[PDB]
Design a protein around this ligand. Structure first.
Ligand SMILES: [Mg+2]
Ligand SMILES: [Mg+2]
Ligand SMILES: [Mg+2]
Ligand SMILES: [Mg+2]
Ligand SMILES: [Mg+2]
Ligand SMILES: [Mg+2]
Ligand SMILES: [Mg+2]
Length: 101
RNA sequence: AGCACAGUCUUAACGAUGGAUGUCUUGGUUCCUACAGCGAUGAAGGCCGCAGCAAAAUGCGAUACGCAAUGAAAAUUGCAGUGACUGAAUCAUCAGAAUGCUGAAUGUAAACUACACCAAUUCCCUGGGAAUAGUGGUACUCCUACAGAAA
């Protein structure tokens, strides 16, 4: 069991680890994403390469009035994660789209 | 409106082709002088990023072609925008802050963003109130000290 008289390294700086702002970067337009928004209430977000599904969900919860049933993700060949977020039935992605912009 | 045979060869003039010559020169080279190490406080090297419109190089590191601070000091400009009337636009300086993933690489791994285990960790306010699966730590060898067990 450790009992160091002082800790070795103490990062006093504000955390570098990615917050909501930084994790999730921006929604996608593109005809595909628009279609998704219209038809099956799935919002498409470009996110950081090092976002997990859990993390993305958390971000979405924090950044917007969104509850997400399921999140699929993929790594784009442009070095971004694209997260397809299916909203719970209580919410209309269209309305939330409008709210965001 | 006419007249040259055509080809081959030659000469001259005027052009094409090419990049010689000459002229340059933010480069090299040599010599001289001067200092002289970086790294578990994570080096060099490598990746991945980072610009409003951004490929390379250049610079930088999730504060990402820069932050603070200092010394200049009114511009910057391709457009957009940002500034002056001096901690501000731009330079230099650079001591503060920060410094992604790696790499000796060091928790086990490695064509894995695979996997353990131990601390949960972090921030705010003057003992509470908030967050986030996030953050640290754990290599081998060695030294001094301590520990309680072994002969
Ligand atoms: Mg998948
Ligand atoms: Mg003839
Ligand atoms: Mg030496
Ligand atoms: Mg400054
Ligand atoms: Mg000044
Ligand atoms: Mg390792
Ligand atoms: Mg394998």
């Amino acid at each position: 069991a450790r009992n160091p008289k002082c800790p070795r390294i103490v990062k006093s700086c504000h955390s570098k680890t990615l917050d909501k702002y930084g994790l999730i970067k921006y929604p996608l337009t593109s005809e595909k994403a628009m279609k998704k928004i219209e038809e099956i209430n799935t919002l498409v977000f470009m996110c950081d390469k090092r976002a997990n599904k859990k993390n993305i969900k958390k971000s979405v919860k924090n950044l917007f009035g969104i509850e997400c049933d399921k999140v699929n993700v993929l790594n784009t060949l442009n070095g971004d994660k694209k997260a397809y977020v299916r909203l719970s039935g209580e919410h209309d992605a269209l309305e939330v789209a409008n709210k965001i912009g």
